[PDB]
Design a binder for this molecule. Structure first.
Ligand SMILES: [Mg+2]
Ligand SMILES: [Mg+2]
Ligand SMILES: [Mg+2]
Ligand SMILES: [Mg+2]
Ligand SMILES: [Mg+2]
Ligand SMILES: [Mg+2]
Ligand SMILES: [Mg+2]
Ligand SMILES: [Mg+2]
Ligand SMILES: [Mg+2]
Ligand SMILES: [Mg+2]
Ligand SMILES: [Mg+2]
Ligand SMILES: [Mg+2]
Ligand SMILES: [Mg+2]
Ligand SMILES: [Mg+2]
Ligand SMILES: [Mg+2]
Ligand SMILES: [Mg+2]
Ligand SMILES: [Mg+2]
Ligand SMILES: [Mg+2]
Ligand SMILES: [Mg+2]
Ligand SMILES: [Mg+2]
Ligand SMILES: [Mg+2]
Ligand SMILES: [Mg+2]
Ligand SMILES: [Mg+2]
Ligand SMILES: [Mg+2]
Lengths: 181, 113, 39, 138, 261
RNA sequence: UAGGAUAGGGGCCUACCAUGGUGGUGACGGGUGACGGAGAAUUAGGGUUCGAUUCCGGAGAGGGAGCCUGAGAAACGGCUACCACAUCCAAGGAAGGCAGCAGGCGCGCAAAUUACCCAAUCCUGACACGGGGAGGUAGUGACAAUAAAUAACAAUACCGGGCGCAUUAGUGUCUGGUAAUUGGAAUGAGUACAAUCUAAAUCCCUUAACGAGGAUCCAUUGGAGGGCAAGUCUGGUGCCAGCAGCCGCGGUAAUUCCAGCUCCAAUAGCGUAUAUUUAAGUUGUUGCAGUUAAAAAGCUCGUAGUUGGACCUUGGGCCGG
């Protein structure tokens, strides 16, 4: 039975200590400020960050002129720059370890829609993205955790078929017009 | 306004036809039916016969206003009858179908003579 | 083996209220976030 | 002191092999007497209730802990199972099928109930939880 | 098993076929022929996979039953036929001719050749010895047996074989100083020049090779295939002239080629 | 050693001859709830445990045994015989092998439809064409895994704190909210023309028209003494019933039971049992201990084992970057 060969994986991990106030409050700060739906969204960002940090630490352990260090360091730095996760002049691979989960959270399409105007709020931005209302280059994206790249940050705008940047009105805007007539 | 835009398109003389990827754009429409695709394609490739044209595997990209799929233009009716599977011709209306029942389809015929 | 269920049988029966449904999901986290260190 | 020779790998490895038997967990899992236990290396087991007995609690407490003696279908052993909730003993009747699980602590008695390491979790194909919480009846 | 196996499951297929792991449960299982089925490239992959001349299994059969494809000079209608290194695939209906050669990454590529350089192949001799009635004959590594060879051609050498007359027309004496293209191991695809040969009595002979761009490497005798006499090779080379490069070199190649576009 | 047999080597077997062969570096025997590997889980590092299962290799087709056909079988969707079991009978006879697909009984803590198709991948035959319960498709499917709804925005309001006068006020800031307050905008859950999907259907992706006022389109599982996050609130009960992993609670003022309210954590998921890893430097090679907490043999000799003092030029220079 082929299709048994399709891979799949886990994206987050629960905390070792269930109830500690300090972590609880620190996590709720982020879940509120960035308008996330639950702790799992924060924990998957942490897990992705821990992956990239283990890679960076391994490459930093080796010695320069090691072609693995060279090749993978250039690739990892390019990946970090491509998503705006790293300022200019920072391509030293020690500034990857300094990178924070707030930086990943800052690149989600929810946060960028809020930060670009268009939203008036962080929760308005989410409900705006999950209602087919926002496009990136030409495509209607409705996943708030899209993680835009720095190149495509310019072309974000409203959809051509949402009332707020497109064409025809919605259910209720038409419904009131018909009952009015 | 619908447009048609074929890519990865190559004519082969082995099976005497030409293959391509249709990337129809239909802003405002839901999707383009394969019959209308047949007709429109006939008038960019001037086929004299709109039965040698075959289209399949259409997707209708998420967000709408875009559809891709695979297109085959033949050069004969003979070539389309030899080089095309039966169900595809049935879909284009050049053939007819049958069914099955598996007991005695061979089992008791095995055992008489 | 006689008194099995005693206290469960003694108590008064009381019925729950019809309180308003509380928001679910992101909205619940919003309420918690602005209840913990905004007030 | 510890052997440290380069050519001492046999001595170290054989020593660890001998000494691991001094560890109660290793010996418990590697000696085979778990297949002689009631459940025979199983999480749960089904049984028929033989009678309802009721057991006292140990000294610092004072109460009657209401348990049902069950016979295991798979092997015919006889055990006692606690019926956890207030009034759930009255759901238990005589000669009805019952699903029993462990008590926690992996075969060791829990709390103030003397010599009981099993708990009743289902009766007549229906949960004690649903009967105590009125979600389903039998 | 009580006999020969007739299916090849897709995960067990050779890695250089580049068959995708979810594209079915089975792989074409090359039939017996002139190549060892782990170093061949069946016709199903040449037509359906690489050349995209057909979209399905049965379309390849529809192509072959019509006698278009020609392998090394004869028309081969078998669908899992094991075409291999240095064979010629010809489609006269399209008038197109391909020599099967390796690329530096160890995968078969169809290098287009002209009609002049399609009437011949090169073939390495497995051995030479006598046959019935004292007649000498030589073995190639792709099944061909030729009788009455030039009495100089010894084992491991190379021969040019015209496909028209089917006899020898020239040969290369395997020795230090000739260009060779590696056909096995991690170095397959890399061309080079034989710089050293060290014998070992009772084991495999090892060859030490030096690329034209200076990189030095080594293989064993069975994996080396001479192409030409002297530094000049007698046959065309593919997109890279058999020169391996590091991953950093091709990273530079992509980014440098990303500034003109 | 010589034969016989085999496709072939070989005590494989026969005749004769010699007395060897393995073993504390563990033979031989026993257990395995033991098919081996690729691999799996957890992993600072070192490790610990698992590997029936889709790839590779092996083995079996109720248990043994013997075979024919054939290039290939000690074949079981082939045969012959026995043992176990069992079927049709007109009582003389005949036919058996689901550890193939689906299904049934039993066993159980524990596992899906007696469906469609060769259209994809491939195999196979005299064969481009037939066949394929291989394989695919759909159905059942909270095994695991991914994304992600259950509301957003506005002004009103009894109000509530900083920031504008901060004096003496008073309200206005980001709105924080009991507010079934008021107000439209937005949307997909659902329904469904159509097209598309497909072998034929189906689901998805597009989509006409419907489809949201908060009682509903209504989120649950566990908790609130400590560990461990969250009540010294209100009724009941009175060492009872019950809770409680552990410490403990309950004997008339229960922070622990039975309930209500309220609060807490995770959240379409959460609890429980068992096994296993971590914690565990509580198996310690890295890396633990042995006066008194468990633990130096009463003492010495001694073979294997482990361990083993110093000593024999690359030392003094040129040479190129
Ligand atoms: Mg222990
Ligand atoms: Mg087999
Ligand atoms: Mg084959
Ligand atoms: Mg002999
Ligand atoms: Mg076994
Ligand atoms: Mg088993
Ligand atoms: Mg197998
Ligand atoms: Mg067998
Ligand atoms: Mg059986
Ligand atoms: Mg047999
Ligand atoms: Mg069978
Ligand atoms: Mg079955
Ligand atoms: Mg609750
Ligand atoms: Mg409770
Ligand atoms: Mg607690
Ligand atoms: Mg606390
Ligand atoms: Mg518990
Ligand atoms: Mg105590
Ligand atoms: Mg408690
Ligand atoms: Mg309570
Ligand atoms: Mg200790
Ligand atoms: Mg003492
Ligand atoms: Mg002592
Ligand atoms: Mg000694």
């Amino acid at each position: 039975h082929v299709n048994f060969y399709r891979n799949y994986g886990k994206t987050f991990k629960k905390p070792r200590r269930p109830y500690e106030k300090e972590r609880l409050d620190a996590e709720l700060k982020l879940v509120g400020e960035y308008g996330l739906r639950c702790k799992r969204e924060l924990w998957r960002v942490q897990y992705a960050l821990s992956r990239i940090r283990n890679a960076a630490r391994h490459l930093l352990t080796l010695d320069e002129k090691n072609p693995r260090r060279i090749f993978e360091g250039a690739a990892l730095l390019r990946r970090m720059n491509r998503y705006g996760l790293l300022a200019e002049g920072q391509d030293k691979l020690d500034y990857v370890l300094a990178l924070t989960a707030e930086n990943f959270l800052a690149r989600r399409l929810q946060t960028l829609v809020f930060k670009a105007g268009m939203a008036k709020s962080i929760h308005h931005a989410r409900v705006l993205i999950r209602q087919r209302h926002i496009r990136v280059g030409r495509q209607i994206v409705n996943v708030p955790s899209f993680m835009v790249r720095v190149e495509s940050e310019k072309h974000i705008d409203f959809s051509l078929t949402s009332p707020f940047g497109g064409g025809p009105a919605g259910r209720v805007k038409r419904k009131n017009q018909k009952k009015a007539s | 306004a619908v447009t048609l835009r074929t890519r990865k398109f190559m004519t082969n003389r082995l099976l005497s036809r030409k293959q391509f990827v249709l990337e129809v754009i239909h802003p405002g429409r839901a999707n383009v039916s394969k019959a209308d695709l047949k007709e429109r394609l006939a008038k960019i490739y001037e086929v004299k016969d709109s039965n040698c044209i075959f289209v399949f595997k259409f997707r209708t990209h998420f967000g709408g206003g875009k559809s891709t799929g695979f297109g085959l233009i033949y050069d004969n009716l003979e070539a389309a009858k030899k080089f095309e599977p039966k169900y595809r011709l049935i879909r284009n209306g050049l053939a007819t179908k049958v069914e099955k029942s598996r007991k005695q389809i061979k089992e008791r015929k095995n055992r008489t003579k | 083996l006689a008194r099995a269920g005693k206290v469960r049988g003694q108590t008064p029966k009381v019925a729950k209220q019809d309180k308003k449904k509380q928001p679910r999901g992101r909205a619940h986290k919003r309420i918690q976030y602005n209840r913990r260190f905004v007030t | 002191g510890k052997t440290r020779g380069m050519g001492a790998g046999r001595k170290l490895k054989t020593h660890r092999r001998n000494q691991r038997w001094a560890d109660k967990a290793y010996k418990k899992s590697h000696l085979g007497n778990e297949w002689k236990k009631p459940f025979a290396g199983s999480s749960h087991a089904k049984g028929i209730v033989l009678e309802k007995i009721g057991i006292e609690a140990k000294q610092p407490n004072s109460a009657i802990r209401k348990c049902a003696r069950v016979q295991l279908v798979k092997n015919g052993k006889k055990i006692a199972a606690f019926v956890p909730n207030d009034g759930c003993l009255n759901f238990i009747e005589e000669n009805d099928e019952v699903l029993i699980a462990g008590f926690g602590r992996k075969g060791h008695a829990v709390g103030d109930i003397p010599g009981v390491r099993f708990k009743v979790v289902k009766v007549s194909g229906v949960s004690l939880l649903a009967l105590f919480k009125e979600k389903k009846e039998k | 098993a009580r006999g020969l196996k007739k299916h090849l499951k897709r995960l067990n297929a050779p890695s250089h076929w580049m068959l995708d792991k979810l594209g079915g449960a089975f792989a074409p299982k090359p039939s017996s022929g002139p190549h060892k089925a782990r170093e061949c490239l069946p016709l199903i992959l040449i037509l359906r996979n690489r050349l995209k001349y057909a979209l399905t299994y049965r379309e390849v059969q529809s192509i072959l039953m019509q006698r278009h494809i020609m392998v090394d000079g004869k028309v081969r209608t078998d669908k899992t036929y094991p075409a291999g290194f240095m064979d010629i695939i010809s489609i006269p209906k399209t008038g197109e001719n391909y020599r099967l050669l390796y690329d530096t990454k160890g995968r078969f590529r169809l290098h287009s050749v002209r009609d002049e350089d399609a009437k011949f192949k090169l073939c390495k001799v497995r051995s030479v010895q006598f046959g019935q009635k004292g007649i000498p004959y030589l073995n190639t590594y792709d099944g061909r047996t030729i009788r009455y060879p030039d009495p100089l051609i010894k084992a491991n050498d190379t021969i040019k074989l015209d496909l028209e007359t089917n006899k020898i027309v020239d040969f290369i004496k395997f020795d230090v100083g000739n260009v060779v293209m590696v056909t096995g191991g991690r170095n397959t695809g890399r061309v080079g020049v034989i710089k050293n040969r060290e014998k070992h009595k009772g084991t495999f002979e090892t060859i030490h090779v030096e690329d034209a761009q200076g990189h030095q490497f080594a293989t064993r005798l069975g994996n080396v295939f001479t192409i030409g006499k002297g530094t000049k090779p007698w046959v065309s080379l593919p997109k890279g002239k058999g020169i391996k490069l590091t991953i950093i070199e091709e990273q530079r190649k992509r980014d440098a080629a990303a500034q003109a576009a």
